[PDB]
């Protein structure tokens, strides 16, 4: 019949191939597909969902829900500060963003952060959210944070300030520090100490290349 000749690679089993498998049950006709709500067609649709970031993950507050709460209410040291990279960072590694990025080796994109102030409706103050570029050093003072990139976030007007941090990739990252511009001003009835929740997702669109096994599972 047809003269064929087997190339190198015949009668082998490459694990990652896409050949036509001979079906064991050919007569069998499978169940018709109904419409089920909430289809996922791409993994990066999970990374685009905001989720609470455990910024206050200090040594004794990680098995409770005090990990998610940033205590607000000393103006010389910042409120919080963390590396801005969803991989290899204790704060952003178990986020929905940071967990769908540990399945991959090459990823690059931007990341948006939402700071929801969960204090009273009468508490009023200012917080200064500074961003350092990936090469720069952290601000040691509030003035040195003001001279860089910042957003003086008035709490009494808006209760949710949104960032969008670019240049986030791996294959020495940024910083999101936060400072007391003013103290929390509060009437006699409302409580003095408040909390700030944080969030993280993919800002506009996220690029991600090389799939691997996750490190968390043992």
């Amino acid at each position: 019949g047809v003269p064929v000749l087997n190339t190198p690679g015949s009668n082998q089993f490459l694990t990652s191939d896409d050949y036509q498998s001979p079906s064991a049950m050919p007569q069998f006709d499978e169940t018709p597909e109904m419409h089920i709500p909430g289809e996922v067609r791409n993994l990066m649709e999970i990374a685009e969902v905001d989720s609470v970031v455990p910024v206050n993950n200090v040594t004794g507050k990680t098995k409770s829900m005090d990990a998610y709460q940033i205590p607000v209410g000393d103006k010389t040291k910042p409120i919080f500060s963390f590396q801005m990279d969803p991989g290899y960072s204790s704060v952003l590694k178990r986020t929905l963003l940071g967990e769908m990025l540990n399945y991959y080796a090459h990823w690059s994109g931007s990341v948006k952060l939402t700071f929801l102030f969960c204090g009273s409706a009468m508490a009023t103050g200012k917080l200064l959210i500074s961003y350092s570029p990936p090469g720069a050093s952290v601000p040691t003072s509030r003035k040195d944070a003001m001279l860089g990139t910042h957003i003086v976030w008035d709490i009494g007007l808006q209760s949710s300030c949104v960032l969008c941090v670019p240049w986030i990739s791996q294959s020495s990252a940024g910083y999101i520090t936060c400072w007391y511009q003013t103290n929390i001003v509060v009437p006699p009835g409302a409580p003095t100490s408040c909390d700030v929740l944080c969030f993280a997702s993919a800002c506009n669109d996220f690029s991600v290349r090389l799939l691997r096994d996750t490190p968390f599972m043992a």
Binding site: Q12, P22, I36, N42, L211, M217
Partner: protein, 224 residues
């Protein structure tokens, strides 16, 4: 390593078929050829489920509902003769199982089986979407028996079958101990209802029980 300009724009590797559709070894087992005419060590079983090893199990728990064809390719070895021929019998969810290597179930016409002889390419058998419902359920917050009886969390919709494997050679002069490695692969996979990733380590292969684990790794202060 150093931080490079990782400049490209692609999410083709993040789709569901390019995330789940990867062949992984899910079942090693030994089975002899001779001796002990009534023994359970002359064939293999492996009830097919996604909750086999925790690395794959974790990926199937990203999503509540998913449907997919499976296309497994066995990799069969031998130790210690003639040329050996094997039999990999897939029984459906409604199917009789053998109790011994010489049971009559092995001859059932409704149980498809491949007869792979040694030396050739590995045997590949493909199984369509069997389930009664419209998708396989990774999680089932419900009770199998009505009125809150036993067996929490186990539905019969996500039953995929079993995979009985034996030598077809009746006997041998010496002992031959064959080893099989089943390579499971989802195919033509759809997935619904995303779900947060597993945090705690796995305890048992038929339940969701866990030990309370910390959220993230701890650091010294909030500002360092």
């Amino acid at each position: 390593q150093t931080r490079h300009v990782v400049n490209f724009h692609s999410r083709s590797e993040s789709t569901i078929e390019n995330f789940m559709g990867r062949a992984a070894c899910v079942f090693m087992d030994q089975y002899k050829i001779n001796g002990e005419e009534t023994s359970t060590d002359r064939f293999a079983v492996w009830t097919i489920n996604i909750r086999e090893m925790a690395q794959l199990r974790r990926k199937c728990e990203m999503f509540t509902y998913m449907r997919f064809d499976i296309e497994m390719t066995m990799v069969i070895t031998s130790c210690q003769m003639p040329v050996l021929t094997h039999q990999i019998m897939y029984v459906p969810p409604g199917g009789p199982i053998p109790a011994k290597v010489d049971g009559y179930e092995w001859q059932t016409s409704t149980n498809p089986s491949v007869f792979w002889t040694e030396g050739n390419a590995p045997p590949r058998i493909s199984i369509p979407f069997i389930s009664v419902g419209n998708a396989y359920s990774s999680f089932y917050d419900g009770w199998s028996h009505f009125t809150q009886d036993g067996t929490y969390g186990y539905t019969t919709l996500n039953a995929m079958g079993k995979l009985y494997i034996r030598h077809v050679n009746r006997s041998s002069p010496h002992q031959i101990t064959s080893t099989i490695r089943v390579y499971f692969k989802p195919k033509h996979i759809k997935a619904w209802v995303p779900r947060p990733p597993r945090l705690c380590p796995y305890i048992n292969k038929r339940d969701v029980n866990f030990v309370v684990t910390e959220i993230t790794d701890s650091r010294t202060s909030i500002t360092d």
